[PDB]
Amino acid sequence: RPARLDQLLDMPAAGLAVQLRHAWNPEDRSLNVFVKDDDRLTFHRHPVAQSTDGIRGKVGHARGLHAWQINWPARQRGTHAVVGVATARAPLHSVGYTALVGSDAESWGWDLGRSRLYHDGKNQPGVAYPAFLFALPDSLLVVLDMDEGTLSFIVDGQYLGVAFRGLKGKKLYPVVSAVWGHCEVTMRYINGLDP
């Protein structure tokens, strides 16, 4: 476990303005999702059949260590609830029900129900994650180290290890892909550290 991870986590979490600046982007989304009027940190997915839908955060990270919390009620996950990161090129919509985040070279994601990591998922098989194994609770932390070029996760205070490597040099945004009608996913930026 990196020492920098605890340094970031043990600072008081970012305030509302920062949370809002790093929240889901209403300009960068599948047309089937919308940022809630009463809660700018959460999106709502319209109940569209045979549709996979994504949204990126407003901020693309290039350097430093960053973490954010995803709150995704377990009952609102369906067959493919994928959490991760993506370049600006990652498609935010697919037909059918797919692990859209992690489907090609432009995104990396953890499919919550399958407990599988996808990257270039159309050509590469999913990877079991965590490596030691797992029923996922409603919230999890996503840790993006743009200096080491890693993606990691924290579930129930437990650091689950490195999920992905080779992210340095990219501009990566928080992203999720959802298939469940009426699902609501909240993202709250925790904090960032400089390189």
């Binding site: 109940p47 059949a49 369906g78 067959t79 029900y97 298939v179 469940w180 009608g181």
Partner: peptide, 8 residues
């Protein structure tokens, strides 16, 4: 509703 992803 046949759909298993709450899309009905």
């Amino acid at each position: 509703x046949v759909d298993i992803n709450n899309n009905c």
